[PDB]
Design an enzyme around this catalytic site. Sequence first.
Site, PDB file in Angstrom:
ATOM      1  CE1 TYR A  64      49.165  60.468  47.256  1.00  0.00           C
ATOM      2  CE2 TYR A  64      47.061  59.846  45.905  1.00  0.00           C
ATOM      3  CZ  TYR A  64      47.738  60.248  47.114  1.00  0.00           C
ATOM      4  OH  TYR A  64      46.864  60.744  48.405  1.00  0.00           O
ATOM      5  CB  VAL A 133      46.205  57.100  40.436  1.00  0.00           C
ATOM      6  CG1 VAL A 133      46.926  57.554  41.538  1.00  0.00           C
ATOM      7  CG2 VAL A 133      46.904  55.930  39.788  1.00  0.00           C
ATOM      8  CB  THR A 166      31.267  70.265  51.092  1.00  0.00           C
ATOM      9  OG1 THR A 166      31.473  69.156  49.924  1.00  0.00           O
ATOM     10  CG2 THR A 166      30.713  69.463  52.337  1.00  0.00           C
ATOM     11  CD  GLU A 224      35.030  67.002  45.295  1.00  0.00           C
ATOM     12  OE1 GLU A 224      35.415  66.049  44.793  1.00  0.00           O
ATOM     13  OE2 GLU A 224      34.949  67.288  46.577  1.00  0.00           O
TER      14      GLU A 224
HETATM   15  C1  LIG Z   1      34.691  57.285  47.717  1.00  0.00           C
HETATM   16  C2  LIG Z   1      35.300  58.189  48.251  1.00  0.00           C
HETATM   17  C3  LIG Z   1      34.430  59.151  49.042  1.00  0.00           C
HETATM   18  C4  LIG Z   1      34.648  58.985  50.973  1.00  0.00           C
HETATM   19  C5  LIG Z   1      33.796  60.179  51.568  1.00  0.00           C
HETATM   20  C6  LIG Z   1      34.545  61.321  52.153  1.00  0.00           C
HETATM   21  O1  LIG Z   1      34.625  61.921  50.649  1.00  0.00           O
HETATM   22  C7  LIG Z   1      35.484  63.320  50.965  1.00  0.00           C
HETATM   23  O2  LIG Z   1      34.736  64.330  50.665  1.00  0.00           O
HETATM   24  C8  LIG Z   1      35.120  65.767  50.463  1.00  0.00           C
HETATM   25  C9  LIG Z   1      33.811  66.662  50.063  1.00  0.00           C
HETATM   26  O3  LIG Z   1      32.999  66.940  51.266  1.00  0.00           O
HETATM   27  C10 LIG Z   1      36.334  65.828  49.300  1.00  0.00           C
HETATM   28  O4  LIG Z   1      35.460  65.143  48.147  1.00  0.00           O
HETATM   29  C11 LIG Z   1      37.259  64.664  49.731  1.00  0.00           C
HETATM   30  N1  LIG Z   1      38.228  64.443  48.569  1.00  0.00           N
HETATM   31  C12 LIG Z   1      36.753  63.267  50.179  1.00  0.00           C
HETATM   32  O5  LIG Z   1      37.544  62.495  50.751  1.00  0.00           O
HETATM   33  C13 LIG Z   1      38.581  62.094  50.094  1.00  0.00           C
HETATM   34  O6  LIG Z   1      38.136  60.477  50.067  1.00  0.00           O
HETATM   35  C14 LIG Z   1      37.996  59.917  51.114  1.00  0.00           C
HETATM   36  C15 LIG Z   1      37.813  58.327  50.683  1.00  0.00           C
HETATM   37  C16 LIG Z   1      39.547  59.820  51.891  1.00  0.00           C
HETATM   38  O7  LIG Z   1      40.479  59.028  51.141  1.00  0.00           O
HETATM   39  C17 LIG Z   1      39.693  61.220  52.029  1.00  0.00           C
HETATM   40  O8  LIG Z   1      41.433  61.292  52.827  1.00  0.00           O
HETATM   41  C18 LIG Z   1      39.731  62.073  50.859  1.00  0.00           C
HETATM   42  O9  LIG Z   1      40.167  63.321  50.852  1.00  0.00           O
HETATM   43  O1  LIG Z   2      51.191  63.628  46.017  1.00  0.00           O
HETATM   44  C1  LIG Z   2      50.299  63.283  45.294  1.00  0.00           C
HETATM   45  C2  LIG Z   2      48.663  63.933  45.651  1.00  0.00           C
HETATM   46  C3  LIG Z   2      47.784  63.526  44.677  1.00  0.00           C
HETATM   47  N1  LIG Z   2      48.159  62.972  43.499  1.00  0.00           N
HETATM   48  C4  LIG Z   2      46.884  62.458  42.699  1.00  0.00           C
HETATM   49  O2  LIG Z   2      45.767  63.334  43.058  1.00  0.00           O
HETATM   50  C5  LIG Z   2      44.560  62.563  43.007  1.00  0.00           C
HETATM   51  C6  LIG Z   2      43.605  63.207  44.372  1.00  0.00           C
HETATM   52  O3  LIG Z   2      44.276  63.043  45.474  1.00  0.00           O
HETATM   53  P1  LIG Z   2      44.179  61.984  46.665  1.00  0.00           P
HETATM   54  O4  LIG Z   2      44.049  60.706  46.378  1.00  0.00           O
HETATM   55  O5  LIG Z   2      44.997  62.637  47.885  1.00  0.00           O
HETATM   56  O6  LIG Z   2      42.526  62.665  47.056  1.00  0.00           O
HETATM   57  P2  LIG Z   2      41.439  61.970  47.744  1.00  0.00           P
HETATM   58  O7  LIG Z   2      40.622  61.350  46.792  1.00  0.00           O
HETATM   59  O8  LIG Z   2      41.851  61.329  48.751  1.00  0.00           O
HETATM   60  O9  LIG Z   2      40.384  63.171  48.069  1.00  0.00           O
HETATM   61  C7  LIG Z   2      45.219  61.315  43.297  1.00  0.00           C
HETATM   62  O10 LIG Z   2      44.302  60.235  42.903  1.00  0.00           O
HETATM   63  C8  LIG Z   2      46.438  61.359  42.613  1.00  0.00           C
HETATM   64  O11 LIG Z   2      46.323  60.851  41.182  1.00  0.00           O
HETATM   65  C9  LIG Z   2      49.451  62.676  43.162  1.00  0.00           C
HETATM   66  O12 LIG Z   2      49.681  62.048  42.038  1.00  0.00           O
HETATM   67  N2  LIG Z   2      50.542  62.904  43.936  1.00  0.00           N
END
Ligand SMILES: CCCCCCO[C@@H]1O[C@H](CO)[C@H](O)[C@H](N)[C@H]1O[C@@H]1O[C@@H](C)[C@@H](O)[C@@H](O)[C@@H]1O
Ligand SMILES: O=c1ccn([C@@H]2O[C@H](COP(=O)(O)OP(=O)(O)O)[C@@H](O)[C@H]2O)c(=O)[nH]1
Length: 266
Positions: A64, A133, A166, A224
């Site tokens: 990251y 990030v 969720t 979350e």
């Molecule tokens: C702007 C980003 C939102 C996209 C929709 C999917 O959101 C996912 O929602 C779950 C709850 O139901 C969690 O909050 C996940 N962390 C969210 O997914 C993350 O964001 C999306 C865009 C992908 O990058 C996914 O891999 C991540 O886990």
């Molecule tokens: O190996 C890792 C996994 C996660 N993150 C941090 O954890 C946040 C949330 O993780 P990710 O982007 O994987 O989550 P998403 O938004 O995809 O649910 C990222 O923005 C990073 O800041 C990191 O620093 N290293």
Amino acid sequence: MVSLPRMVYPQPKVLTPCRKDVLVVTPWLAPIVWEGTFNIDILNEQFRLQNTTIGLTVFAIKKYVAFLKLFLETAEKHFMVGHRVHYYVFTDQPAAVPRVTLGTGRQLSVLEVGAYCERRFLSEVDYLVCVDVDMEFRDHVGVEILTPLFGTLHPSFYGSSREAFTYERRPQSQAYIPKDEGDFYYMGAFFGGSVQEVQRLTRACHQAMMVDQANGIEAVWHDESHLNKYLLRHKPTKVLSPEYLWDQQLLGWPAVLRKLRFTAVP
Ligand SMILES: CCCCCCO[C@@H]1O[C@H](CO)[C@H](O)[C@H](N)[C@H]1O[C@@H]1O[C@@H](C)[C@@H](O)[C@@H](O)[C@@H]1O
Ligand SMILES: O=c1ccn([C@@H]2O[C@H](COP(=O)(O)OP(=O)(O)O)[C@@H](O)[C@H]2O)c(=O)[nH]1
Ligand SMILES: [Hg+2]
Ligand SMILES: [Hg+2]
Ligand SMILES: [Hg+2]
Ligand SMILES: [Mn+2]
């Protein structure tokens, strides 16, 4: 604190709402921030008169660290421009942090992680903003978000019924929230508030997660899930609209969003 100077701007219209298509205030009277609801000139005046310093924290571990350049460069163009900003980058690769040019009154501190003071925040910034990030700023993200405690509406559930949220649904988890409870589903990728309130939130979540671990259970959406439980029981003083957390690739650009301010990086 100090008096605002004379300012010339459009008179607010009591019998004319700014936005008629969305809810702009929560039932506990916390503003829901959407474009059109605030005059940034008035807000900038108020916060500059207080010499406000905003801390922006991000974690960049492993691969990251690759998102840091775009994140910081775009933050320089859209985040709290005009105000004092202190970036805190927590990483396991200090030497991997890119050399980004910063505007005046803005600084960046690299904190190596793997183990290694919260008292630091109390003496260096007034507000803490915690974000993911793997994002980039595309438009204005300013003092309109500052308040004691704020959460951001998850882009996938802002128009959903609470039953669809969720949340963690198992009573055995500290993050448990039944189907008949819940205001909104907040995304853990963007939250903040005063240093004191943010630390209270993080301490509460840390303790709740430890209890869950001891009971052999992990919340469906981890941190979350706990953030949502905390904000359910401790109402945020401001809620940010999805303008502040979007993904144009997966969700497009709905008419309800006049601006896309902070988005996921493809
Ligand atoms: C702007 C980003 C939102 C996209 C929709 C999917 O959101 C996912 O929602 C779950 C709850 O139901 C969690 O909050 C996940 N962390 C969210 O997914 C993350 O964001 C999306 C865009 C992908 O990058 C996914 O891999 C991540 O886990
Ligand atoms: O190996 C890792 C996994 C996660 N993150 C941090 O954890 C946040 C949330 O993780 P990710 O982007 O994987 O989550 P998403 O938004 O995809 O649910 C990222 O923005 C990073 O800041 C990191 O620093 N290293
Ligand atoms: Hg933080
Ligand atoms: Hg919590
Ligand atoms: Hg949390
Ligand atoms: Mn992310």
